[PDB]
Design a protein around this ligand. Sequence first.
Ligand SMILES: [Zn+2]
Ligand SMILES: [Zn+2]
Ligand SMILES: [Zn+2]
Length: 178
Amino acid sequence: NSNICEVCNKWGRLFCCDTCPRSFHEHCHIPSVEANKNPWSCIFCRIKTIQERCPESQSGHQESEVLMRQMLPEEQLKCEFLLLKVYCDSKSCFFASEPYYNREGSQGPQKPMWLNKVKTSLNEQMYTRVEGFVQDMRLIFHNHKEFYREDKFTRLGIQVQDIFEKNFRNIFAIQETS
Ligand SMILES: [Zn+2]
Ligand SMILES: [Zn+2]
Ligand SMILES: [Zn+2]
């Protein structure tokens, strides 16, 4: 197994996957690494299994259809993995915890949103469709763009949104377009 957490790239108390060489901190893995389960398979392995069981699940899809899917076990897992892929980027630190807004010439957003709030919402099964999860994720970056206006710090939101959107297209097998 790897000697660092796959998500945060630090050593520490790590749990090792039995079917691939990745390792995780307890709360870096999503869902949080399970108490028992020998062997244990990480979320990367579980996602790969879905694809292997149904190769046709990788044919192209329309975003509009994906968003309307109910949050059954497989779509729940896919959103957990997409969330994890965002946390894997170090720039996710800016969007992880609850923000506050006091900047001359800007007003805070009507509906603040952050990664740990989405994490909790997934854990507590508060989304009924894929749409609910994707809307909250996109709202994080949209709030950031709006608040920071012409400050160059707005680019952090563009960067992390791009990581989200690429991973969304990959995980849910969105039809490639020009
Ligand atoms: Zn970690
Ligand atoms: Zn694994
Ligand atoms: Zn199939």
